[PDB]
Amino acid sequence: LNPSARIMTFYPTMEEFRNFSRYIAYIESQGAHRAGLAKVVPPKEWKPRASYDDIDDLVIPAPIQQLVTGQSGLFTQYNIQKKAMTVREFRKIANSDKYCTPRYSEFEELERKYWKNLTFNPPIYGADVNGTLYEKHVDEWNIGRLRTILDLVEKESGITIEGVNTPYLYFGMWKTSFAWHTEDMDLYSINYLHFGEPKSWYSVPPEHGKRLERLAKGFFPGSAQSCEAFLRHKMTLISPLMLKKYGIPFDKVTQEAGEFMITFPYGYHAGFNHGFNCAESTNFATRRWIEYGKQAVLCSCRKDMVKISMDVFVRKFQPERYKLWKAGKDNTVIDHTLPT
Amino acid sequence: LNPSARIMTFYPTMEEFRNFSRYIAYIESQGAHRAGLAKVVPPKEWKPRASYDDIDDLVIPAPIQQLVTGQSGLFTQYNIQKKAMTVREFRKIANSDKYCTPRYSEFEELERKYWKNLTFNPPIYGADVNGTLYEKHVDEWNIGRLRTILDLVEKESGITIEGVNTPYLYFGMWKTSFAWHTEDMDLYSINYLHFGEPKSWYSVPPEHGKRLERLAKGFFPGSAQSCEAFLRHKMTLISPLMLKKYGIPFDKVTQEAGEFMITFPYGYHAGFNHGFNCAESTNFATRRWIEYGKQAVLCSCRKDMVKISMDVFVRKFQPERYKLWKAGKDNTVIDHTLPT
Ligand SMILES: [Cl-]
Ligand SMILES: [Cl-]
Ligand code: NI
Ligand code: NI
Ligand SMILES: [Zn+2]
Ligand SMILES: [Zn+2]
């Protein structure tokens, strides 16, 4: 099931959509997770918010400017912090003549332009904004309260991790980028594009993640020297042309307003925004993730970084192996194809 | 005198060198200041310091990484702050295989390389380090105590301005850059290259500064919109090929270890380091500067920036015009050619 590991798109009915957990399992039962990434277009009956008319006053505390250096499809992205601005201010710049989306025909033409011009004209990205655009009445696919077993991190340790077990908003503009990475603790993510122009994504099947890690280490050995998980710094950009060249399998998908994307444990993704827009994301967990989390290779090289204790998930959901794992003796092998 | 406004080099004897003020006047009497920049190679009898063997332990608190974006000779340079390192650490990186000076023949070949590669491989620059490498016994050309009338800023207002009336050290490496600018308040500067590889400079005659300002505003109108003195942000790099093209006259000069450079009021300069090195600089003033300082166009757009009060210099050195200037009625025109 999903032999080719292509990115699947799903159209749940309202009835299916009302159960989050079951639907994630369903799409895994269809092999969605093999591609690393899937699209879910929600039922038309559903709406996260009445309208987006009342948010120009919303404050993006820490926009960042994306400076990118490199050539022939390899690049590194440095984030310069800029001062507080409002969505109103952000929108004016995004729509301004210097920063706005070029004219184009097919997405293939806009994609060529992103890669020929990513080093020029650094854009602002209103990233990592704490908050949510969902009205409180909304019970389905509400990113602020999915009620997955990730909630055990908070319930048992009083711990908050911004953007991991709380929601983040991302205001974008043409050519703002997200670099190749997997999620914190190789968790799942969910991303909803509330409005505006598209966000294109690239994904590599989890069963080929190690081959992308290997290639990255080749091209950036110094970065590989000082961190094992350097891709987790989210600074590394690699062209699809580079990926074909070193035979890394990958797929591409464009997300439009009103659509969800789900990323799956150890699914490497990257991409960029087409123009002004607003996405909302968080991380979540399932019982299948637990193994991935026990085995996730973390960033050593910074003290900021996200470490979740696996003790509570193994204690409850893998009792048969708890003592074994506790003693360094749990040698489970992950099969990335299983829908477990 | 100096019709062509070329960068002059001077070889003072020890006897001439012992009087700083007089020697600056002498070189101005030869028209050195018309080029904006002059070299002074000091008498061999003189040495700022016995040796530079005891400074690996010296701490550079705020190295910065120089990210540069642009193309066909126009660029903007953003400074990412990195963590504390020692000269020892700095030296290892500077000398490392990824960061070190390419092999080359003539400087013309190394200059081509700086401009073809300035956007790649961002280097660290151990800039703006408070301190001095001069032994205390040294009375000539001692950057920490030139005793110019700039000392009135401190004596009358208790004011310290790091790198302006105190010394700064600059540890460099291949391809670290200083962008087109004039000094704070269009003051004079002095730069001494204590050791290591060269530092190349570009200069534009003060009598053609407005033409470079004009060209800059053309190429960066947005930056020109929000600041009048945007070049003062020290972010703007412009190729010599661009300067020929728009007919801005300029000259180039390479400074080697043990040599001083002097910049003159309203002399636009820029350049770069050839490899690992260490320069020391500060600003100074003469009576000729006072007019330039009364008329200097400042950065509006940041509250950090350097504003020196001219009151005390006009009061003492232009008493005939004090009341007039006080009342908005002093309409002196600067002649950049005069040695005044
Ligand atoms: Cl590297
Ligand atoms: Cl501009
Ligand atoms: Ni992510
Ligand atoms: Ni300067
Ligand atoms: Zn790391
Ligand atoms: Zn300014």
XYZ file of C-alpha atoms and ligand atoms in Angstrom:
686
model
C 0.000 0.000 0.000
C 1.482 3.249 -1.453
C 4.338 1.199 -3.104
C 5.650 4.353 -4.851
C 5.643 6.539 -1.678
C 3.809 9.476 -3.483
C 2.191 12.264 -1.559
C -1.458 11.441 -1.146
C -4.373 13.866 -0.898
C -7.567 13.015 1.097
C -11.044 14.376 1.125
C -12.717 13.407 4.347
C -16.496 13.783 4.854
C -17.640 15.651 7.880
C -18.462 12.440 9.619
C -14.874 11.126 9.160
C -13.355 14.493 9.991
C -15.011 14.720 13.446
C -12.642 11.940 14.694
C -9.051 13.158 14.324
C -7.191 10.239 15.663
C -9.182 7.725 13.603
C -8.647 9.667 10.418
C -4.872 9.868 10.915
C -4.973 6.087 11.348
C -7.078 5.702 8.242
C -4.650 7.618 6.079
C -1.788 5.652 7.534
C -3.825 2.502 6.734
C -3.639 3.762 3.059
C 0.108 4.247 3.264
C 0.030 8.073 3.308
C 2.906 8.044 5.755
C 5.266 6.448 3.348
C 5.672 9.656 1.399
C 6.310 11.607 4.621
C 3.696 14.161 3.934
C -0.004 14.181 3.003
C -2.612 16.644 2.076
C -6.072 16.728 3.708
C -8.717 19.000 2.206
C -11.450 19.374 4.783
C -15.113 19.151 4.328
C -16.681 22.308 2.979
C -19.078 22.316 5.967
C -16.120 23.204 8.166
C -14.587 26.548 8.897
C -11.916 27.373 11.498
C -13.014 31.030 11.627
C -15.884 33.180 10.207
C -13.546 35.688 8.538
C -9.999 37.091 8.647
C -10.970 40.789 8.630
C -10.065 41.677 12.165
C -6.368 40.791 12.306
C -4.454 43.664 10.768
C -3.877 44.728 14.373
C -2.214 41.488 15.186
C 1.350 41.786 16.286
C 4.222 39.675 14.959
C 6.836 40.186 17.696
C 9.964 38.842 15.945
C 9.813 38.812 12.136
C 13.033 37.600 10.729
C 14.863 38.306 7.568
C 16.071 35.430 5.638
C 19.588 35.733 4.395
C 20.660 32.959 2.151
C 24.076 32.199 0.718
C 25.225 29.576 -1.820
C 25.196 28.287 -5.340
C 24.216 25.501 -7.832
C 21.397 24.326 -5.557
C 23.078 24.290 -2.093
C 22.429 26.996 0.433
C 22.444 28.000 4.051
C 19.880 30.366 5.555
C 20.563 32.766 8.359
C 17.832 34.521 10.208
C 18.305 38.155 11.168
C 15.746 39.257 13.807
C 13.882 42.564 12.931
C 11.603 44.696 15.129
C 7.904 44.128 16.042
C 5.455 44.766 13.242
C 1.744 44.269 12.641
C 0.128 42.101 10.041
C -0.952 45.376 8.470
C 2.747 46.455 8.188
C 3.741 42.931 7.089
C 1.087 42.902 4.416
C 2.164 46.247 2.957
C 5.710 45.086 2.556
C 4.706 41.656 1.242
C 2.492 43.282 -1.338
C 5.003 46.061 -2.108
C 6.667 46.131 -5.542
C 10.089 44.981 -4.334
C 8.863 41.935 -2.401
C 5.774 40.648 -4.198
C 5.258 37.550 -6.236
C 6.595 37.676 -9.767
C 4.216 37.263 -12.728
C 4.237 33.620 -13.925
C 2.334 30.849 -15.823
C 2.779 27.334 -14.373
C 4.165 26.563 -10.930
C 7.157 24.995 -12.706
C 8.078 28.602 -13.830
C 7.588 30.045 -10.288
C 9.702 27.206 -8.823
C 12.604 27.996 -11.275
C 12.386 31.554 -10.040
C 12.532 30.667 -6.425
C 15.752 28.739 -6.940
C 17.390 31.261 -9.274
C 16.581 34.094 -6.872
C 16.619 32.832 -3.309
C 19.981 34.549 -2.450
C 18.782 37.983 -3.677
C 16.406 40.363 -2.001
C 16.030 38.829 1.452
C 12.350 38.697 2.633
C 10.758 39.048 5.966
C 8.923 36.035 7.453
C 6.562 36.571 10.341
C 7.394 33.209 11.772
C 6.857 31.513 15.084
C 4.121 33.756 16.311
C 2.452 32.367 19.391
C -1.295 32.140 18.890
C -4.238 30.682 16.999
C -6.780 31.872 14.476
C -9.408 29.202 15.395
C -12.614 30.362 16.996
C -13.134 28.515 20.331
C -16.393 26.735 19.320
C -14.568 24.609 16.685
C -14.137 20.974 17.754
C -12.702 19.357 14.617
C -9.046 19.504 13.663
C -8.485 22.324 16.101
C -4.755 22.770 16.181
C -4.881 24.283 19.636
C -6.532 21.104 21.059
C -6.064 17.893 19.076
C -6.011 15.836 22.311
C -3.310 13.441 21.153
C -0.967 11.617 23.482
C 1.454 14.501 23.097
C -0.733 16.006 25.873
C 1.036 13.726 28.359
C 4.110 15.933 28.114
C 2.158 18.863 29.676
C -0.079 16.845 32.004
C 2.896 15.076 33.635
C 5.665 17.700 33.659
C 3.857 21.107 33.613
C 6.026 21.717 30.425
C 5.129 24.120 27.606
C 7.112 24.038 24.335
C 6.126 26.830 22.044
C 5.064 25.527 18.600
C 5.397 21.873 19.702
C 2.522 21.449 22.170
C 1.151 24.929 21.481
C 0.231 26.545 18.147
C 2.314 28.894 16.040
C 1.245 31.208 13.225
C 3.401 31.933 10.137
C 2.814 35.001 8.046
C 4.636 34.658 4.794
C 5.630 36.428 1.664
C 7.113 35.544 -1.650
C 10.209 33.421 -1.419
C 10.220 32.871 2.381
C 11.582 29.366 2.995
C 11.596 26.505 5.383
C 14.610 24.400 5.296
C 15.027 20.656 5.148
C 14.194 19.091 8.492
C 12.135 16.624 10.492
C 10.155 17.659 13.451
C 11.164 17.923 16.993
C 11.587 14.430 18.371
C 10.600 13.289 14.912
C 6.961 13.996 15.925
C 4.073 14.446 13.539
C 3.067 17.959 12.469
C -0.083 19.558 11.236
C -0.155 22.747 9.183
C -3.258 24.678 8.121
C -3.123 27.438 5.587
C -5.714 29.908 6.796
C -5.502 32.304 3.810
C -3.490 33.916 1.096
C -1.233 32.454 -1.512
C 0.108 28.880 -1.604
C 2.930 27.176 0.240
C 4.866 24.595 -1.793
C 6.441 21.603 -0.083
C 9.105 18.998 -0.822
C 9.259 15.642 0.995
C 11.510 12.668 1.241
C 10.080 9.288 2.318
C 11.099 8.337 5.876
C 12.519 5.118 4.494
C 15.068 7.312 2.624
C 15.783 9.875 5.311
C 19.141 8.397 6.172
C 20.145 8.875 2.505
C 19.367 12.572 2.725
C 21.180 12.897 6.030
C 24.135 11.215 4.313
C 24.135 13.567 1.349
C 23.766 16.616 3.635
C 26.767 15.524 5.672
C 28.779 15.230 2.363
C 27.963 18.753 1.299
C 28.301 20.410 4.813
C 30.965 18.391 6.668
C 31.908 21.132 9.023
C 28.324 21.522 10.175
C 28.214 17.747 10.421
C 31.451 17.847 12.541
C 29.996 20.051 15.321
C 26.433 18.745 15.373
C 25.162 15.232 14.479
C 21.649 16.519 13.876
C 22.696 19.741 12.073
C 19.690 19.655 9.725
C 17.673 20.411 12.867
C 19.111 23.932 12.807
C 16.734 24.464 9.848
C 19.425 26.332 7.875
C 20.012 24.007 5.047
C 18.379 24.353 1.643
C 18.816 21.859 -1.146
C 17.453 22.053 -4.593
C 15.303 19.347 -6.145
C 17.863 19.256 -8.986
C 20.461 18.294 -6.366
C 18.208 15.587 -5.020
C 17.722 13.956 -8.502
C 21.390 14.183 -9.096
C 22.323 12.176 -5.924
C 19.253 9.953 -6.426
C 17.330 10.915 -3.295
C 13.665 10.135 -3.894
C 11.336 13.010 -3.092
C 7.991 14.401 -4.105
C 6.538 17.949 -4.295
C 3.113 19.269 -3.417
C 1.493 22.696 -3.349
C -0.836 23.559 -0.395
C -3.574 26.211 -1.016
C -5.688 28.206 1.329
C -8.075 26.090 3.357
C -5.948 22.917 3.065
C -4.102 20.885 5.766
C -0.778 19.169 5.434
C 0.305 16.428 7.804
C 3.946 15.458 8.243
C 4.811 12.026 9.605
C 7.559 10.899 11.926
C 10.959 11.162 10.295
C 9.591 12.685 7.126
C 12.076 15.265 5.860
C 10.382 18.286 4.336
C 11.157 21.763 3.092
C 9.601 24.431 0.957
C 8.495 28.005 0.401
C 5.664 30.556 0.289
C 4.325 31.925 -3.042
C 3.277 35.326 -1.561
C 1.404 36.870 1.370
C -0.197 34.159 3.540
C -0.940 32.740 6.954
C -0.481 29.161 8.142
C -0.952 27.689 11.610
C 0.891 24.642 12.880
C 1.705 22.491 15.832
C 3.109 19.044 16.525
C 1.207 15.963 17.564
C 1.854 12.338 18.514
C 0.448 8.867 18.035
C 1.270 5.570 19.529
C 3.277 4.719 16.291
C 5.599 7.704 16.974
C 6.810 6.428 20.298
C 9.480 4.262 18.733
C 10.633 7.115 16.509
C 10.934 9.282 19.617
C 12.925 6.791 21.592
C 15.332 6.642 18.607
C 15.419 10.275 17.507
C 18.884 11.724 17.010
C 18.872 15.170 18.702
C 20.911 18.425 18.305
C 23.788 18.207 20.827
C 25.268 21.605 19.913
C 22.769 24.110 21.483
C 21.173 24.164 24.985
C 17.961 25.768 23.776
C 16.867 22.579 21.905
C 13.827 20.344 22.415
C 14.203 17.178 24.489
C 11.010 15.336 25.425
C 11.196 12.580 28.001
C 10.029 9.295 26.553
C 9.612 7.658 30.005
C 5.854 8.207 30.248
C 5.092 6.998 26.749
C 7.113 3.792 27.168
C 5.725 3.205 30.643
C 2.121 3.212 29.532
C 2.138 2.230 25.916
C 5.083 -0.246 25.868
C 4.901 -1.803 29.393
C 6.196 -5.168 28.071
C 9.501 -3.257 27.116
C 9.745 -0.613 29.809
C 12.356 -2.275 32.065
C 14.291 -3.436 29.034
C 14.441 0.070 27.513
C 15.264 1.510 30.941
C 18.318 -0.789 30.992
C 19.691 0.119 27.567
C 18.543 -3.204 26.181
C 15.573 -2.381 23.944
C 16.686 -2.927 20.432
C 13.488 -2.449 18.469
C 13.976 -1.846 14.716
C 11.682 0.666 13.070
C 9.883 -0.377 9.942
C 8.846 2.922 8.294
C 6.300 1.098 6.016
C 4.103 -0.307 8.809
C 0.790 1.577 9.529
C 1.211 0.108 13.077
C 48.532 70.750 -5.242
C 47.415 67.103 -5.797
C 45.431 68.197 -8.951
C 44.578 64.541 -9.738
C 43.364 63.691 -6.181
C 45.499 60.425 -6.035
C 46.179 58.663 -2.790
C 49.520 59.824 -1.502
C 52.009 57.865 0.597
C 54.388 59.607 3.088
C 57.550 58.590 4.794
C 58.095 60.794 7.788
C 61.445 60.888 9.646
C 61.369 60.354 13.342
C 61.767 64.028 13.935
C 58.644 64.834 11.837
C 56.710 61.921 13.289
C 57.080 63.101 16.922
C 54.621 65.980 16.170
C 51.294 64.473 15.086
C 49.292 67.548 14.533
C 52.026 69.248 12.495
C 52.471 66.234 10.278
C 48.747 65.977 9.503
C 48.949 69.647 8.512
C 52.002 68.995 6.395
C 50.326 66.256 4.412
C 47.280 68.424 3.974
C 49.675 71.183 2.805
C 50.659 68.642 0.029
C 47.040 68.017 -0.882
C 46.842 64.493 0.599
C 43.316 65.234 1.732
C 42.023 65.663 -1.740
C 42.086 61.942 -2.375
C 40.266 61.284 0.918
C 42.779 58.839 2.155
C 46.566 58.724 2.609
C 49.162 56.275 3.602
C 51.851 57.034 6.217
C 54.690 54.550 6.653
C 56.357 55.343 9.947
C 59.964 55.626 10.711
C 61.680 52.308 11.243
C 62.918 53.567 14.642
C 59.338 53.360 15.873
C 57.427 50.430 17.224
C 53.985 50.450 18.876
C 54.726 47.183 20.713
C 57.755 44.858 21.253
C 55.957 41.760 19.946
C 52.496 40.261 19.359
C 53.166 36.895 21.043
C 51.059 37.320 24.123
C 47.601 37.945 22.666
C 46.132 34.585 21.752
C 44.300 34.895 25.069
C 42.681 38.086 24.010
C 38.944 37.978 23.865
C 36.839 39.250 20.963
C 33.425 39.614 22.636
C 31.172 40.000 19.564
C 32.605 38.628 16.309
C 30.140 39.013 13.553
C 29.446 37.065 10.461
C 29.159 38.934 7.317
C 26.258 37.956 5.163
C 26.198 39.623 1.833
C 23.527 39.566 -0.844
C 23.484 40.980 -4.401
C 24.790 40.872 -7.913
C 26.740 42.596 -10.769
C 28.695 44.717 -8.281
C 25.948 45.920 -5.868
C 25.520 44.392 -2.461
C 24.213 44.801 1.036
C 25.952 43.338 4.081
C 24.200 42.107 7.165
C 26.020 41.350 10.338
C 25.007 38.307 12.354
C 26.442 38.436 15.911
C 28.265 35.173 17.009
C 29.517 34.164 20.471
C 32.718 35.277 22.303
C 35.921 33.815 20.946
C 39.641 34.302 21.499
C 42.183 35.455 18.993
C 43.509 31.913 19.213
C 40.060 30.560 18.117
C 39.735 33.350 15.524
C 43.134 32.566 14.100
C 42.391 28.855 13.712
C 39.277 29.543 11.735
C 40.895 32.301 9.668
C 43.737 29.988 8.787
C 41.454 26.960 8.300
C 41.050 25.511 4.793
C 37.507 26.794 4.253
C 38.207 30.414 5.213
C 41.801 31.148 4.227
C 43.184 33.298 1.491
C 43.116 31.784 -1.968
C 46.378 31.230 -3.878
C 47.009 34.161 -6.269
C 49.624 36.153 -8.294
C 48.951 39.916 -8.492
C 46.537 41.813 -6.268
C 44.435 42.406 -9.398
C 43.709 38.586 -9.346
C 42.873 38.594 -5.582
C 40.583 41.625 -6.082
C 38.636 39.790 -8.892
C 38.184 36.966 -6.433
C 36.883 39.117 -3.684
C 34.165 40.496 -5.933
C 33.248 37.184 -7.573
C 33.004 35.504 -4.171
C 31.847 37.990 -1.570
C 28.286 36.492 -1.328
C 29.595 32.936 -0.713
C 31.098 31.512 2.423
C 30.386 34.237 4.969
C 33.448 35.044 7.188
C 33.791 36.060 10.740
C 35.212 39.526 11.531
C 36.415 40.257 15.027
C 35.375 43.846 14.738
C 34.873 46.681 17.156
C 36.874 45.241 19.975
C 37.492 47.781 22.689
C 41.193 48.057 23.441
C 44.694 48.906 22.261
C 47.854 47.039 21.379
C 50.189 50.030 22.075
C 52.577 49.764 24.975
C 52.061 52.745 27.351
C 55.582 54.239 26.921
C 54.903 55.110 23.236
C 54.381 58.844 22.669
C 54.205 59.084 18.871
C 51.087 58.349 16.862
C 49.545 56.601 19.826
C 45.987 55.967 18.797
C 44.835 55.854 22.390
C 46.116 59.437 23.002
C 46.564 61.645 19.939
C 45.558 64.746 21.957
C 43.575 66.354 19.154
C 40.710 68.749 19.701
C 38.375 65.773 19.616
C 39.387 65.553 23.316
C 37.038 68.467 24.022
C 34.087 66.125 23.587
C 35.194 64.120 26.684
C 36.641 67.002 28.708
C 33.416 69.046 28.457
C 30.632 66.438 28.512
C 32.116 63.385 30.346
C 31.118 61.494 27.080
C 32.753 58.284 25.835
C 32.004 57.015 22.304
C 33.517 53.646 21.689
C 35.768 53.648 18.588
C 35.328 57.419 18.075
C 37.219 58.920 21.026
C 38.505 55.533 22.183
C 40.388 52.863 20.209
C 38.989 49.766 18.552
C 40.790 46.652 17.335
C 39.762 44.691 14.203
C 40.815 41.114 13.729
C 40.228 40.105 10.172
C 40.236 37.239 7.784
C 40.025 36.731 4.087
C 37.184 38.575 2.453
C 35.924 40.492 5.533
C 34.674 43.874 4.305
C 34.045 47.409 5.306
C 31.386 49.124 3.431
C 31.297 52.510 1.775
C 31.052 55.254 4.370
C 32.474 58.418 5.884
C 33.261 58.689 9.497
C 31.098 59.689 12.317
C 30.469 63.406 12.072
C 32.642 63.249 8.992
C 35.668 63.213 11.361
C 39.156 62.108 10.442
C 40.226 58.524 11.157
C 43.492 56.797 11.749
C 44.040 53.087 11.179
C 47.182 51.114 12.026
C 47.728 47.610 10.810
C 49.585 45.943 13.647
C 50.235 42.603 11.880
C 49.157 39.969 9.449
C 48.020 40.206 5.887
C 47.033 43.392 4.030
C 43.874 45.465 4.039
C 42.918 46.973 0.669
C 41.062 50.272 0.507
C 38.988 52.233 -1.998
C 38.453 56.005 -1.722
C 36.458 58.700 -3.372
C 37.662 62.326 -3.209
C 35.565 64.456 -0.828
C 34.917 66.831 -3.696
C 33.010 63.935 -5.364
C 31.257 62.508 -2.333
C 27.913 63.970 -3.271
C 28.180 62.102 -6.607
C 28.588 58.810 -4.784
C 25.746 59.611 -2.418
C 23.666 60.335 -5.526
C 24.511 57.058 -7.220
C 23.879 55.105 -3.988
C 20.446 56.669 -3.646
C 19.698 55.581 -7.298
C 20.587 51.978 -6.637
C 18.969 51.722 -3.098
C 15.976 54.099 -3.143
C 14.110 52.369 -0.411
C 17.057 52.676 1.944
C 17.331 56.271 0.796
C 13.569 56.746 1.571
C 13.845 55.832 5.284
C 17.260 57.300 6.052
C 18.991 60.310 4.407
C 22.406 59.130 5.551
C 21.817 55.407 4.830
C 25.439 54.819 3.785
C 26.217 55.418 7.466
C 24.651 52.037 8.231
C 27.848 50.607 6.673
C 25.864 47.965 4.748
C 26.428 49.033 1.242
C 29.089 47.562 -1.022
C 29.791 48.810 -4.506
C 32.223 47.445 -6.955
C 34.948 49.522 -8.572
C 33.514 48.381 -11.929
C 30.253 50.068 -10.898
C 32.094 53.227 -9.975
C 33.839 53.481 -13.426
C 30.582 52.804 -15.098
C 28.767 55.775 -13.413
C 31.968 57.854 -13.631
C 32.649 58.252 -9.915
C 36.343 59.000 -9.482
C 38.064 56.790 -6.935
C 41.454 55.351 -6.164
C 42.643 52.091 -4.522
C 45.471 51.424 -2.115
C 46.739 48.383 -0.238
C 47.867 48.834 3.425
C 50.468 46.331 4.797
C 51.524 45.493 8.279
C 53.221 48.365 10.058
C 51.536 51.053 7.911
C 49.026 53.812 8.869
C 46.134 55.056 6.822
C 44.500 58.400 7.490
C 40.999 59.217 6.278
C 39.957 62.842 5.892
C 36.668 64.562 6.553
C 34.011 63.485 4.088
C 36.266 60.992 2.374
C 34.189 57.966 1.394
C 36.092 54.717 1.767
C 35.551 50.983 1.717
C 37.555 47.825 1.384
C 38.541 44.382 2.602
C 41.064 42.168 4.408
C 43.357 39.756 2.487
C 43.610 37.224 5.383
C 44.272 37.005 9.123
C 45.222 40.427 10.538
C 44.860 43.056 13.217
C 44.267 46.782 12.764
C 43.635 49.462 15.378
C 41.680 52.630 14.725
C 40.061 55.662 16.206
C 38.740 59.018 15.054
C 40.381 62.385 15.455
C 39.696 66.052 14.715
C 41.411 69.185 13.492
C 40.355 72.738 13.284
C 39.625 72.191 9.489
C 37.014 69.523 10.399
C 34.837 71.854 12.392
C 33.007 73.102 9.333
C 32.486 69.558 8.075
C 31.006 68.681 11.464
C 28.636 71.586 11.576
C 27.397 70.457 8.124
C 27.444 66.678 8.489
C 24.262 64.919 7.423
C 23.470 62.354 10.167
C 21.471 59.054 10.338
C 17.932 59.997 11.465
C 16.624 56.410 11.432
C 18.270 54.840 14.564
C 18.578 56.193 18.153
C 21.895 54.476 18.789
C 23.768 56.811 16.360
C 26.600 59.274 17.003
C 25.758 62.950 17.496
C 28.562 65.218 18.704
C 27.700 68.713 19.849
C 29.507 71.298 17.775
C 28.839 74.122 20.296
C 32.247 73.956 21.981
C 34.229 73.831 18.765
C 32.405 76.821 17.256
C 32.572 78.745 20.514
C 36.330 78.569 20.776
C 37.604 78.138 17.278
C 35.022 80.217 15.323
C 34.104 82.977 17.857
C 33.563 85.518 15.029
C 30.656 83.172 13.792
C 29.337 81.703 17.018
C 26.235 83.903 17.470
C 25.522 83.726 13.764
C 25.661 79.904 13.696
C 23.631 79.784 16.915
C 20.902 81.728 15.074
C 20.712 79.526 11.983
C 22.482 82.168 9.942
C 25.971 80.777 9.317
C 26.152 79.907 5.701
C 29.786 78.952 5.262
C 30.557 76.971 2.073
C 33.099 74.188 2.356
C 35.916 74.117 -0.127
C 37.226 70.520 0.020
C 40.508 71.537 -1.764
C 41.720 74.021 0.876
C 44.459 72.765 3.318
C 42.962 75.412 5.700
Cl 30.705 22.841 6.339
Cl 16.033 49.872 -1.692
Ni 8.463 21.408 10.492
Ni 35.598 54.233 8.898
Zn 23.045 21.253 16.697
Zn 19.822 55.695 9.273
